[PDB]
Amino acid sequence: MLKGKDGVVKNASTGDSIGHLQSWALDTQRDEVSGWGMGDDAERAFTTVGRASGNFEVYLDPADPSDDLEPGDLVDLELYPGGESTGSGYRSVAGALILSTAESASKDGIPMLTVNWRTSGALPQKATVS
Amino acid sequence: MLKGKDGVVKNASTGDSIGHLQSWALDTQRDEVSGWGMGDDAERAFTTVGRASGNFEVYLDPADPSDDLEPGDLVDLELYPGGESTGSGYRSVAGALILSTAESASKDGIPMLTVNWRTSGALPQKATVS
Amino acid sequence: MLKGKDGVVKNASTGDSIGHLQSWALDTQRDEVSGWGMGDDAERAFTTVGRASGNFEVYLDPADPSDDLEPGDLVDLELYPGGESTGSGYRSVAGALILSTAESASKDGIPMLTVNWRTSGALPQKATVS
Amino acid sequence: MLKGKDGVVKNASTGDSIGHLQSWALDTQRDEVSGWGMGDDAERAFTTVGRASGNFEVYLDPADPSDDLEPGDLVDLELYPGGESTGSGYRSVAGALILSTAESASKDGIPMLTVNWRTSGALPQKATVS
Amino acid sequence: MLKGKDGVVKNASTGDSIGHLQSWALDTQRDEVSGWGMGDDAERAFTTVGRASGNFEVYLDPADPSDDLEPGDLVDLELYPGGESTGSGYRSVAGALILSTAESASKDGIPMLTVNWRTSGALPQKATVS
Amino acid sequence: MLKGKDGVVKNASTGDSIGHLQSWALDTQRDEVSGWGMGDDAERAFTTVGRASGNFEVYLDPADPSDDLEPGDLVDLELYPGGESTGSGYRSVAGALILSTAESASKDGIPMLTVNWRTSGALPQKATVS
Amino acid sequence: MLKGKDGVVKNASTGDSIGHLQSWALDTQRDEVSGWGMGDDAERAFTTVGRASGNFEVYLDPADPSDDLEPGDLVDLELYPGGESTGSGYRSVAGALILSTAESASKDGIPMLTVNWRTSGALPQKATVS
Amino acid sequence: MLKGKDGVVKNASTGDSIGHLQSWALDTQRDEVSGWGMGDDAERAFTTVGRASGNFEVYLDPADPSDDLEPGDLVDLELYPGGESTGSGYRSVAGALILSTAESASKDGIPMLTVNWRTSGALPQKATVS
Amino acid sequence: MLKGKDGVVKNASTGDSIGHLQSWALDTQRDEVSGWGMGDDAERAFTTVGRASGNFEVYLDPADPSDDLEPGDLVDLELYPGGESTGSGYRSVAGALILSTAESASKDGIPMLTVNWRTSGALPQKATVS
Amino acid sequence: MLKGKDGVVKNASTGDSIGHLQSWALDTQRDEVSGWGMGDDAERAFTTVGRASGNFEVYLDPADPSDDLEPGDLVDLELYPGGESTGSGYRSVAGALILSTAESASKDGIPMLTVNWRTSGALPQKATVS
Amino acid sequence: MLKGKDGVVKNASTGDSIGHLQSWALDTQRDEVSGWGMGDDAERAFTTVGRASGNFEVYLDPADPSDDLEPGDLVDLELYPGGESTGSGYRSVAGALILSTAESASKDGIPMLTVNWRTSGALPQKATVS
Amino acid sequence: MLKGKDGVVKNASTGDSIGHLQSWALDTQRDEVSGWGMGDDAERAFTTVGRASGNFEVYLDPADPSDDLEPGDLVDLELYPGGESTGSGYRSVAGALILSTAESASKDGIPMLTVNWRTSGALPQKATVS
């Protein structure tokens, strides 16, 4: 049961936390393939190839490392679900591909920014901080 | 009327409970085929081939057997809906295929993990614990 | 205005009530066919062939006749919307085809089971109990 | 502003109110066709052919004229939105085609029935009761 | 900031307000077309042809000018968002094509009517009442 | 953390604030392309071409610069998320293409207007006001 | 506008409906001959000799009169496009020549049979059932 | 822009509309002849002789003037693309030669009939109805 | 209405089912001959000589009796459209000539094999299993 | 990147736009001739003589200059792919030979006309409008 | 049921896998010869001579062994449908004749290459890897 | 795996990129010759002579080097599948013969141009840019 309010995201290439974070997310998939013949009871399957994707939502501030993210950039990410304290696992993604951003606001809210990324060629490598 | 808060899931291959569980689910299907002729009142049907699928949601903790689950792995599962007390039925699935995982968090919550699996070649075999 | 809390479902073949029931449902359809010509005001229609389908949700208990239901089985059903008291209509379905089941649970609930069936060759025959 | 709780539906062929009604509905449509050329500012349209459809929901009671409705029947309907008092408009539909029914219940409710119909060859003819 | 409760709709051809109104709506669109070549950074666009559409919902009363609206009719509309007081802009639509109507009711409500229209050949012409 | 209630939008061509604003929004995308061969573990990707889109919602008033916006117009926009005070970043979009508008009202509300635009040939150019 | 789902085909010689029918078809042709001279504006034509052909597709069942059809057989057919009710026209073909059959199936379908015939010496004689 | 749903076809000889029409079609051709010499840049051409052809598809009904059409008949046709209202052009074909018919049906459709004709000696003469 | 998913094919010479089947097919033909004289209304026909042909598609597995099939082999086949249960008709072909095979695969599929055969000297002999 | 919705076609002889256009097309070809000797690696080629062809599709209206087009006519065409604004290239074809026309309609469409032409003796001469 | 995503192709002469593969295919044929006499029921056949052919599609990369393939080359191929693991059958073709290649691309795709080959003098020799 | 959206085509003679490209394509062939004798098992083959062909599709713009391409011209081409960056292979074709062009448009599209060429005397010479 990790705290959840200690989550830290970093741009690994430049070494700088994101900023006013609100939520993160991650995912992993593999495609399936199913087949069966005339006279079988159950159908078989297997997994071909894998992906990864995720996003995060921050408060919009122009003076942040969150501002430099632009669609099409390649960035090395590190997600700390439980903080940076030693022994806390962190998923590090190499070659993360930023796909789209979406800024918005309301008459009674704070301008928010949603970055949405993807993986390109590599998969999230789990690890344990020292 | 089983308790519901006693549900236990196990990795049958290695023999280790999952961890901080939140909910599980299971399913079974068979495809249908319908036909009728010119001049019939009702249409006929039958079932061809079967499947199974399900998922479960846990609290994210790196030091757990829940962490070793990766998309594409083949694992032997056992679901105890009412606990491990003798005489409690348990659905055991052989060759379960883990298909996708999805980790997430919020600024006021606990990091959660959703594993989502499938069956490959075999179907859930009901039984009764000794 | 039937009571609704007296509803009874039976496996007609073996003669045994289902168990801890939560809700039932039923349906009937007929396909439509519409046509019109160049210079018509309204379009005509008619009904070709009929079906039936429904489901029900029970509390999961292994020691019940609800447990023996498996996808692909053929079972003779009888639905008593208002109980078994004499003069209460009951829809009896012959050759009901059970299509899928879906068991689930939560950390603060009761394990539930949803059976989902269909009709194959026959249609629900209304009647009046003696 | 009609009362709404006085709505009466009738089977015009046999002359018998439906029963414990809960809600009714009606509709009318005409298909559209749009076209434009290279160099036009706005696009033109027109309406080809018309339909009608609707439904109503009643409490399930076997001893009612609502029970005799079966998918595929042809029935002459009359809808009184504001009651049967003189001078109250009523939409009368000839050759209404009943398309599907759907009975259901819950463990804490009343068994309900939803009839769903259509029009075949004719359109709803408004009128004013004497 | 117009009042919103003063909105008036008229049938311009005959000169008669609608009746017990509940809400109106309007819309305008133009289709887009996008293209790009091998080696471009951004994609270009432009707008081809335009439309208009909208609806309104009234209380069902047979003795109203709202009753004469039938699918397929051509009517000249005028929408006064802020009333008929001098200097209040009003969108006047010529050749409005009424496409569908949908009457309904409940056991504890008022019978309502939803008219749904379109434009055919012309576009809404803004203006300012004298 | 920008205030959010100070957001200002301008028509850059004519130099005039919009009016009673309620909310704005913006977006940027780039399409993705994925490929893999027989015998690969992960799938590769890259981004081809980019877009931009957004909208904003105002109170409907005929005597405003918001009224002159018509579908199909080309307008130069400037969005000030945090006001016009010096040092506040503003996204300026050149050649913004207005795509659709949607006016509406209720019996207990204020007539609202939703403008919905797009970009054509250029992308939002961030900057910092002097 | 005949129903289409009432179509009946018969072997007139033995008097037995076909079986589970799916679709029928028929055709009639006459060859053309065109000629023109040096200095003519349009070309002339006429029709020499006529034929007939068609087919039908049934569900494959060995215990049917559909099974006895073999390529090369001569059979007297009668096609009822709208059923056998009195006053319904039926095309009766004498000396129909069955030319080819084609049985097939899939892993998720019903074995189907396509009979394909021709006419030999006579042409389809329309009539009206008594 | 003619309506298209008002198209009327007539047998000019007997004066009777066809019936439930679905679509019509027409055509005109002239053969080409090309030649060139040793040392020319472009090739020359001209048109020798002309034809006409077309078809139409109706719902199959034995009690119609559509039923009397048989391959080999000579019939005088008139096609009204936009109806019979005065001032609407109509292509009248003299000596139309009916070449083939093709009736068909499905288990969920309406029996359709496709007549296919030709011209013999004359060409379609355009005109304007009075 | 045979099940279709129970179809069994056998090599009659060695007595061994094929394997993972996907679909089968069969055919029978006879050539036609048509003639007519100067002054006849319809043309006559008859059938000269017959053939047979078909195929089937299996999943590619080297350890199967499907693997031993090579183009040019002579094999005795038996097709069970509805299984091997007693009373189920089966078409037995003697001297079947295997004509061609075609193996293929995709990056996300299962390697498939299509055998395509013919008959040589004999025709399919229908029968009924004991 | 020309707009495409501004395309204008003209009859150059009489000076009158076509009408409700839907699409145009054009083409140019030259025949090829290939040869090689005993002992050559690649084969040679060259182009002998050229042609041109194209078509266009309009909405059928009798009161248009599109109506006067008849197969066999010689007409001087001018195609403006991007409109008639100054500096817009236009392909002018002299002695265009109209080869065939094809009118058609549907029960839910607009009567369309497809003109199909050719070139005779001359080739399309590109130019630039003043 | 081989995996299908493990398929490996090799140039046997030089010993080097192809590269980014997408799909392969193979085929075998033998010509047929049919004859019959005046007075026979069925027609006889036999197979004369055999061939082989196939292709495969790869991603275009100049730095690959796929690049060295040129039309007219003679290459020794080996196809591993299920990978190179021991006991996996592989079809080895000697003297494969590469017949044609076809490179292509799109504005939103990956440049692909399709090699298309044939056999010359020898036939595919099945085997089993050690 | 080349990007595919970076493809560049050049007119090598004048040194000027084409323009708004959409897709390219290329091909190479060699004819085959097969022979066999009375008493052989497989048939032999070989390749005689080679060709090349391809095309590409661009947006129609008169102010481009794409406009100067005319059927019959001889042009020296260079295709860069992966761009002009150093080390990227490019197929250079000498003496390319342009065979035909085909311009077209729609009422909701962009005027497109398809050039279609051939090779004359030489074959595509692969290379590697410096």
Residue numbers in the entry:
A (entry chain G), B (entry chain I), C (entry chain Q), D (entry chain O), E (entry chain M), F (entry chain K), ...: 1 to 130
The authors write:
In this study, we use cryo-electron microscopy (cryo-EM) and structure prediction to determine the atomic structure of the phage R4C capsid and the in-situ structure of the tail machinery to characterize the distinguished long rigid tail.
The aspartate (e.g., D27 and D108) and glutamate (e.g., E32 and E57) residues lining the tunnel form a negatively charged, almost parallel helical track through the tail tube, equidistant spacing of ~16 Å. The inter-monomer interactions within the same TTP disc are dominated by backbone hydrogen bonds between the β-sheet layers, with two electrostatic networks for assisted binding. Specifically, β5 of one TTP interacts with β2 from the adjacent subunit, forming an anti-parallel β-sheet and an extensive hydrogen-bonding network.
